[PDB]
Each structure stands twice: as structure tokens, then as C-alpha cells.
């Protein structure tokens, strides 16, 4: 290959990411080096890059990109289970692999990763927005077969994170139930499709743009209303006043969380997936229906990633993507900031 590789890095606090030529890494024992085939942009990348110097703690420079797919380039010493050339997706939320949470497969909830300094690619470790990347262990590689890399990259976060949020309360979403999806962006437009595939719940979408509402219907939403002060009333108009069994808020604004608490049913669920600084649900007596649980989920488990890949291979996921080159990385992040990307932006080296 080449001694150097193109990469999109966050180098200075408050500055836009830059395209640089950095050394090509080599896999240590147990590690795997991949030739990246597609790297996705996530709105949480903007959040990280918008943190002040006091809060930012992911080191500089940082190769961005935690939505990674690639082909096995080089196997580290003792790495069996994958051959060179195998198409694989990168399981992002790396854990210690030995705590109680990790042994259950829930590595995203590892209780020792923070103490041990184990961070995901693109969020502390070198990310996938580069020609090559290192993966710490073979257990963080999931085969994708002949899936198109551009549509496979979002599965690692844009599919895995909604899939996990939905899975936490899937038994509540039988026939007759209603699931409200707020935000029809990169995550939400996949979350709608997941709901249609693993449940018989009625899906009501919520967003601000008429194009986002049309996208929601395009991907299986049974109904779509506009976000705002009237969103709660519009939803309850469609449910006959009953209230939604579950509300998946992929925006995370205080106004969207407020709408969630106004429409969630008794014994229901609100999932705050989107990140807005300071926004929070208010879980207290007479401020939220009885028994309606609230949680901020984080990414997903490894088996959930394999299930998401299985959904894609069965044709149940229609991922909307716009392709960029590595040199267009910083330009793509400007596009994502202004909300000009319909769906998920993906960089292809």
C-alpha cells in the first residue's frame, strides 16, 4: 500500500476538521487493520467538535468517524476468525470484555471502559474517516457479506442506535400499540423502518420540514405530523386521545422531550436518543404518566449489530445516503451542520 494515508482529523478546538496525510498504522497482536470502504458522518461529531476546551477530552488530533465498514487488510498476530479481504462492520462502543455487562454482550454499557481508557473509534481512538483504520479486537468486527459499503456504514450507528433504543422496550410494541418517532434524520428514518420490521406497532413520525415528513411516509410511517407546540395535540388526534406506547426522540431538544411527555401513555416509554446540551426529561409524580419509563440509551450491543446487518441483508432497510470523498469530509460536516443532508452522509475513500 502506502506509508501514509488520507484522513479527516479534528486538530484544534473551535476549528473545522482538516484533511491530512498521516502515517498508515500497523496491527499489533490481536488487532486488525482495515481498508475503509465507507465512513459515515454523525451529528454527534458536531456535538464533540462544539465542546469547549474544558469539556473536550478525546485528545487532539482525532481521526473522526465512528460509522465504519471496510475489508480486512492485515491480520495481527494470533487473529483468527477473519481472512484478508473479508467485508466487516466495526462495532463501535468498545468495552473491556470482562465485566458483567460485557459478558452479557452489552459492551456498550461496560462499567470499566471509562476507568481503563477504552474509547470508540472516532471518539477517543482513531476513527474510520481515513483510508485505513485499526480495530482493537476481532470481537468488534461483524461480517457484512456482499452488502454495499455505502449503505452498510450507517448500520453501525444510524441503524444500531435506533435498533437498541427500540429493543429495550420491544415487548411493549405488539399489535395495537403506537410508537412515536421524533426526528426523521439519519437515525429516525432508519428507526421507522426497524419498527415496521420487528414489530406490528403503528408508527407516527414527527419532524419540522415537509420533506422529512414525506421521507417518513416513504419509509413506512403510518402517519406524520409536524413538530412544535401543536405536535402533542396532532398525535393524540390520530390516536383518538389514547397516547403513544413508546416515544423515540432522536432530536433530544427540550421541546421534543416535552412533546414526548405530553403524549406518552401510562406504563409507556420515552427514549431520549438525540443529544442537546442541557435538555432532559422531567420524571416526577404528576409531571409524567405513571409507569412511563425514560432512558437515554447509548449505541447498541454486538448481537443487535448482527441483527441490524441481518435486516439489511434481508432487504428490510432502505438507507438514504449521500456520498462524499475524503477531501470533501470537512465540506460534508458543514452540510450536516446546516441540515442539508437528507439522511446519512457517507465518506468513501
Positions touching Zn ion (CB under 5 A) are 42, 44, 67, 95-96, 99, 102, 110, 112, 157
The residues facing 125 across adjacent strands are: 121
Binding mask 127-166 for ligand W3O (x = CB under 6 A): ------------------------------x---x-----
Alpha-helical (H) ranges within the chain are: 43-50, 100-103, 113-116, 149-152, 160-167, 188-198, 210-218, 231-238, 254-263, 302-313, 329-337
Would you say how long the chain is, in residues?
Answer: 349
Give least dist CB 293 to a copy of itself, A. 18
Residue 193 touching ligand W3O (CB under 6 A): no
Q: Which is nearer to a copy of itself, 116 or 283 (CB)?
A: 116
Q: How many residues bind ligand W3O, per CB under 6 A?
A: 13
Cα 98 to Cα 310: distance, rounded to the nearest angstrom: 26
Helix/strand/coil for 270: strand
CA proximity to 68, closest of 49, 43, 42: 42
Q: Which is nearer to a copy of itself, 23 or 174 (CB)?
A: 23
Q: Which is nearer to a copy of itself, 23 or 145 (CB)?
A: 23
Helix/strand/coil for 239: coil
Going from the C-alpha of 191 to that of each of 150, 196, 273, the distances in angstroms are 18, 9, 11
Which of Zn ion, ligand W3O, a copy of itself, none sits in contact with 9, Cβ below 5 to 8 A by type? a copy of itself
Give least dist CB 284 to a copy of itself, A. 27
37-76 binders of a copy of itself (CB under 8 A) = 60-61, 76
Identify the residue among 2, 242, 298, 310 touching ligand W3O (CB under 6 A). Answer: 298
Amino acid at each position: 500500500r502506502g506509508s501514509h494515508m488520507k484522513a479527516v482529523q479534528y486538530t484544534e478546538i473551535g476549528s473545522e476538521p482538516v484533511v491530512v496525510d498521516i502515517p498508515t498504522p500497523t496491527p499489533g497482536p490481536g488487532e486488525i487493520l482495515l481498508k475503509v470502504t465507507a465512513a459515515g458522518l454523525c451529528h454527534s461529531d458536531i456535538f464533540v467538535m462544539d465542546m469547549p476546551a474544558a469539556q473536550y477530552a478525546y485528545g487532539l488530533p482525532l481521526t473522526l468517524g465512528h460509522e465504519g465498514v471496510g475489508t480486512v487488510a492485515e491480520l495481527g498476530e494470533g487473529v483468527t476468525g477473519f481472512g484478508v479481504g473479508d467485508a466487516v462492520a466495526v462495532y463501535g462502543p468498545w468495552g473491556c470484555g470482562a465485566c458483567h455487562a460485557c459478558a452479557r454482550g452489552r459492551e456498550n454499557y461496560c462499567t470499566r471502559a471509562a476507568d481503563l481508557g477504552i474509547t470508540p473509534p472516532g471518539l477517543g481512538s482513531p476513527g474510520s474517516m481515513a483510508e485505513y483504520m485499526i480495530v482493537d479486537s476481532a470481537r468488534h468486527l461483524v461480517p457484512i457479506g456482499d452488502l454495499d459499503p455505502v449503505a452498510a456504514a450507517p448500520l453501525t450507528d444510524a441503524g444500531l442506535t435506533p435498533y437498541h433504543a427500540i429493543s429495550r422496550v420491544l415487548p411493549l410494541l405488539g399489535p395495537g400499540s403506537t410508537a412515536v418517532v421524533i426526528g426523521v434524520g439519519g437515525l429516525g428514518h432508519v428507526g421507522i423502518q426497524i419498527l415496521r420490521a420487528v414489530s406490528a406497532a403503528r408508527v407516527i413520525a414527527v419532524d419540522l420540514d415537509d420533506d422529512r415528513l414525506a421521507l417518513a411516509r416513504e419509509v413506512g410511517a403510518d402517519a406524520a405530523v409536524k413538530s412544535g407546540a401543536g405536535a402533542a395535540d396532532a398525535i393524540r388526534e390520530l390516536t383518538g386521545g389514547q397516547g403513544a406506547t413508546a416515544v423515540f426522540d432522536f432530536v433530544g431538544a427540550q421541546s421534543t422531550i416535552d412533546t414526548a411527555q405530553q403524549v406518552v401513555a401510562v406504563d409507556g416509554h420515552i427514549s431520549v436518543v438525540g443529544i442537546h446540551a442541557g435538555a432532559h426529561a422531567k420524571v416526577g409524580f404528576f409531571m409524567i404518566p405513571f409507569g412511563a419509563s425514560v432512558v437515554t440509551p447509548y449505541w447498541g450491543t454486538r448481537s443487535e449489530l448482527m441483527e441490524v446487518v441481518a435486516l439489511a441483508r434481508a432487504g428490510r432497510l432502505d438507507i438514504h445516503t449521500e456520498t462524499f470523498t475524503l477531501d470533501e469530509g470537512p465540506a460534508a460536516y458543514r452540510r450536516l451542520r446546516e441540515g442539508s443532508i437528507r439522511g446519512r452522509g457517507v465518506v468513501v475513500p
